[PDB]
Motif scaffolding. Structure first.
Motif, mmCIF file in Angstrom:
data_model
loop_
_atom_site.group_PDB
_atom_site.id
_atom_site.type_symbol
_atom_site.label_atom_id
_atom_site.label_comp_id
_atom_site.label_asym_id
_atom_site.label_seq_id
_atom_site.Cartn_x
_atom_site.Cartn_y
_atom_site.Cartn_z
ATOM 1 N N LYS A 39 -38.312 -1.919 -4.703
ATOM 2 C CA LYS A 39 -38.328 -0.929 -3.621
ATOM 3 C C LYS A 39 -39.496 -1.125 -2.654
ATOM 4 O O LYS A 39 -39.313 -0.980 -1.443
ATOM 5 C CB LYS A 39 -38.341 0.475 -4.186
ATOM 6 N N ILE A 42 -38.668 -3.630 0.035
ATOM 7 C CA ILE A 42 -37.597 -3.273 0.961
ATOM 8 C C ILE A 42 -38.223 -2.628 2.206
ATOM 9 O O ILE A 42 -38.761 -1.515 2.126
ATOM 10 C CB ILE A 42 -36.508 -2.372 0.300
ATOM 11 N N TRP A 45 -34.290 0.081 5.476
ATOM 12 C CA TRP A 45 -33.503 1.050 4.738
ATOM 13 C C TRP A 45 -32.438 1.569 5.667
ATOM 14 O O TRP A 45 -32.687 1.757 6.858
ATOM 15 C CB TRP A 45 -34.397 2.198 4.246
ATOM 16 N N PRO A 55 -31.270 0.301 0.490
ATOM 17 C CA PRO A 55 -31.727 -0.818 1.320
ATOM 18 C C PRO A 55 -30.615 -1.242 2.291
ATOM 19 O O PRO A 55 -29.431 -1.104 1.971
ATOM 20 C CB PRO A 55 -32.035 -1.929 0.304
ATOM 21 N N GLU A 57 -29.606 -4.070 3.028
ATOM 22 C CA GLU A 57 -28.829 -5.099 2.356
ATOM 23 C C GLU A 57 -27.547 -4.510 1.775
ATOM 24 O O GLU A 57 -26.478 -5.084 1.972
ATOM 25 C CB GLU A 57 -29.670 -5.732 1.258
#
Ligand SMILES: Cc1oc(-c2ccccc2)cc1C(=O)O
Length: 273
Positions: A39, A42, A45, A55, A57
């Motif tokens: 986290k 990342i 977000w 995230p 992603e």
């Protein structure tokens, strides 16, 4: 839940993206890749149509998820206290393009054409889904060796595709365009085309053309391997210094070098056996 549903196998690799493990979905023995992302690492977000804090992603993988096999499929995801765990499909047997090139050297043009074409279809698919990968490279391309199909992976440096300038970049520098190097400014499609030119060069030469910022900026392409003129032309075109001088995906796919592409199965039969 994540612990019971999946049998964790060996670590496939680790790096900027996190740690990816081979795994098997216990219920049906489905091969999976279990990607762990810290986290704290990342930066981007996003929010899903539900509105959960995940995230980017995960948002991008969901946007690109479909029956189309050119992009890695997100099967499931879990949030842990300090990480996110992504369950991704896992072709078997598989080899990343980087390892493939390391092992085989420079690809025969017929193979590079088939692979490059599949990368183009995969990138076009991302873009149609509003996703800019931003890290198109040999390491982010998996080869499903039996099917001869390529899969674009690692959307961890990606962003939602927009028509305005991007001033942030965390993909691979040696694949980044000169406008990023000089100005810290790039437009999605034309930077993707640049990275595609690096990738194509990498496929047909066995290595990237530029290792340094100055080489990127100069954009002078030297072919260390015998590469056809049509291929060198396409590469030089994707690698035009001026973003606007770069071909669109359509022009790349209508390029004379891109004609008579092998089907992925034909590619597997001829080149991956
Ligand atoms: C780094 C990474 O590796 C994989 C993967 C590797 C072997 C088989 C299947 C998937 C996916 C990702 C990802 O980031 O999406």
């Amino acid at each position: 839940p994540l612990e019971s549903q999946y049998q964790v196998g060996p670590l496939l690799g680790s790096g900027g993206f996190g740690s990816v493990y081979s795994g098997i979905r216990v219920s049906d023995n489905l091969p999976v890749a279990i990607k762990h992302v810290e986290k704290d690492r990342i930066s981007d977000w996003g929010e899903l149509p539900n509105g959960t804090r995940v995230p980017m992603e995960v948002v991008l993988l969901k946007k690109v998820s479909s029956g189309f096999s050119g992009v890695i499929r997100l099967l499931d995801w879990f949030e842990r206290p300090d990480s996110f765990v992504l369950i991704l499909e896992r072709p078997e047997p598989v080899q990343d393009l980087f390892d493939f090139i390391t092992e085989r050297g420079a690809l025969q043009e017929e193979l590079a054409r088939s692979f490059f074409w599949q990368v183009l279809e995969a990138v076009r698919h991302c873009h149609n889904c509003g996703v800019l990968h931003r890290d198109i490279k040999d390491e982010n391309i998996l080869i499903d060796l039996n099917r001869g199909e390529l899969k674009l992976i690692d959307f961890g440096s990606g962003a939602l595709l927009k028509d305005t300038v991007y001033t942030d970049f965390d993909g691979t520098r040696v694949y980044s365009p000169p406008e990023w190097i000089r100005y810290h400014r790039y437009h999605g499609r034309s930077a993707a085309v640049w990275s595609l030119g690096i990738l194509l060069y990498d496929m047909v030469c066995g290595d990237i053309p530029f290792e340094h910022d100055e080489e990127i900026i100069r954009g002078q392409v030297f072919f260390r391997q015998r590469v056809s003129s049509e291929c060198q032309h396409l590469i030089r075109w994707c690698l035009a210094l001026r973003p606007s001088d770069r071909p669109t995906f359509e022009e790349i796919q209508n390029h004379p070098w891109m004609q008579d592409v092998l089907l992925p199965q034909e590619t597997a039969e001829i080149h991956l056996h």
